[PDB]
Symmetry: C2
Subunit: 145 residues, 2 copies
């Protein structure tokens, strides 16, 4: 799967999230500019940008779920898109596992073991932007007729 990673957080554990994600995907853009990640994605017809926002590292150091956003670019509602959705979701689960050793430090951090991330999802369908919705949600709406 082709993914852009946009890392806005300069902290070590953020860097580590980026690294973990990037070993599991086909990096199409890796950096701090969301406009440019959007451009690599539209060019590449890649399905998602994963954003590691500013505050990610600090949350985790505070014993707070870190925010991770996925912007999805759906250009169709078929098999390939379903495969990307499921595959990238699977990759986010795996990232949680690849963060765990870093959460062993404080007691503050111990919840985070099982549930370290707060995943926010946005969906482009045919160039319509549905903020704060996952593709499942968007698809369940439309197909609920």
């Amino acid at each position: 799967q082709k993914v852009a990673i946009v890392r806005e957080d300069t902290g070590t554990i953020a860097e580590l999230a980026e690294k973990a994600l990037g070993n599991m995907v086909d990096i199409v853009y890796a950096g701090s500019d969301l406009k440019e990640a959007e451009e690599a994605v539209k060019k590449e017809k890649a399905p998602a940008i994963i954003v590691i926002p500013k505050g990610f590292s600090q949350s985790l150091e505070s014993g707070e779920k870190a925010r991770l956003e996925i912007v999805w670019y759906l250009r169709g509602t078929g098999l390939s898109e379903a495969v990307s959705t499921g595959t990238i979701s699977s990759l986010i689960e795996s990232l949680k596992v690849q963060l765990a050793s870093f959460l062993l430090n404080d007691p503050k951090k111990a919840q985070l073991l099982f549930d370290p991330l707060e995943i926010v999802q946005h969906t482009y369908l045919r160039g319509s932007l549905f903020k704060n919705h996952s593709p499942e949600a968007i698809m369940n709406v439309f197909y609920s007729q």
Copy 2:
């Protein structure tokens, strides 16, 4: 990861779910008896039983989300348990992908592409049973103090 699969549904797509799961785990018991899967799990100190209940195949043929249950056996609230949780979750995502071709048949089935499964989770913590809760939920409760 060590998992028991308990398949109560005799349909083809159920069989296929079992097969997909089983190629990705270390089968500890595979069959239709939940008491016996519970016994292989407690013996093996495995973390989960995945149940494919009766009605799974029919749901999917009807264009309805199929029910999949996970019973988790937590004997601790640490790294290993967090790794199982995240890993098995990742495996459930992957199963969704491995079902997809079978959902290409009807228009009834087209939603299911993105969201084919209704995942019900139960958690044993130290021999206390918390029906209808995931380990994340149980852990977020206790650590919310």
